[PDB]
């Protein structure tokens, strides 16, 4: 328009862009149509597997995971899948880990099949975030 | 204007309003100026106490807490304060509890004084949310 201003909405995008040598998410990489087609294929081909996308909570200080797409046996429990993720990122047992579905911590005795049927995304994947504890950069 | 529509922004407010016999938050109850004055008074009068507001994560199925404002000794650790909250809501040890500061889980060996100096609100209080595990209404 006529006036202008340092757009506070854009400033985080500029700051994030300057730190590029891209950790884009599964949803940012693939259209909704493509994700829907893919999850339908997975469910047709592997009826007892739940397609899960695992991503670190944005900004968490825990190490990132090398693999984000998992075809998980439906009878695996939340606790068991948490152990699998812990093994994948090699987080020592003494350090806590947390899984989040819809920004809450799923009860650990639920199966991934239960959680999938109730909490799957519109695109047919179950999205699971993980983090550790936050030290806020303080002396622990 | 000229046109109209069932405002999706307002519909959750209508639905929430119909469930009234009000669980408003500390910030919703008190102006920013009043909160700033009060926390400054607390810090002047009790130099080794951190003023903490404890509130259940919105929508969590865990029981609500009867008391939200705490003047916590600064050398109390996060783990110890979690135990205090657990006692206050009488949550059995077998059920998990989580504390959140700025939407993350604070490291359990930090003191409330450390967490206060780093993560206090602009209004001078430390805001701590708590929840349990989410069963998503499923059979546990």
Residue numbers in the entry:
A (entry chain A), B (entry chain A): 1 to 21, 26 to 144
Paper text:
Mammals conserve multiple mammalian Atg8-family proteins (mATG8s) consisting of GABARAP (GABA type A receptor-associated protein) and MAP1LC3/LC3 (microtubule associated protein 1 light chain 3) subfamilies that tightly bind to autophagic membranes in a membrane-anchored form. These proteins are crucial for selective autophagy and recruit proteins bearing LC3-interacting region (LIR) motifs. Many mATG8-interacting proteins contain canonical LIR motifs that have a basic hydrophobic LIR motif with a core consensus sequence of (W/F/Y)-X-X-(L/I/V), which binds to the W- and L-sites conserved in mATG8 proteins using the amino acids W/F/Y and L/I/V, respectively. In this study, we identified LIR motifs specific to the membrane-anchored form of each mATG8 and characterized the residues critical for their selective interaction using cell-based assays and structural analyses.
An atypical LIR motif from SpHfl1 (LIR[Sp]), which binds to Atg8 in yeast, was mostly localized to GABARAPL2- and weakly but significantly localized to GABARAP- and GABARAPL1-containing autophagic membranes. Isothermal titration calorimetry (ITC) experiments further confirmed the strong and specific binding affinity of LIR(Sp) to GABARAPL2; the dissociation constant (Kd) of LIR(Sp) to GABARAPL2 was 0.24 μM, which was 8–12 times lower than that to GABARAP (1.8 μM) and GABARAPL1 (2.9 μM). We successfully determined the structure of the LIR(Sp)-GABARAPL2 fusion protein at a resolution of 1.86 Å. The structure of the LIR(Sp)-GABARAPL2 complex is similar to that of the LIR(Sp)-SpAtg8 complex. The SpHfl1 LIR consists of an α-helix, from D391 to M404, and an N-terminal tail. The helix formed extensive hydrophobic interactions with V51, P52, I55, W62, and I63 of GABARAPL2 using M394, L397, Y398, A401, and M404. Among these, Y398 formed the most critical interaction, as it was inserted deep into the L-site pocket of GABARAPL2. In addition to hydrophobic interactions, three acidic residues of LIR(Sp), D391, E393, and E395, formed electrostatic interactions with K46, R67, and R28 in GABARAPL2, respectively. Although most of the interactions were similar to those in the LIR(Sp)-SpATG8 structure, F388 of SpHfl1 was not inserted into the W-site of GABARAPL2. Among the GABARAPL2 residues involved in the interaction with LIR(Sp), W62 was the sole residue that was not conserved in other mATG8 proteins (F, K, or S was also observed at this position).
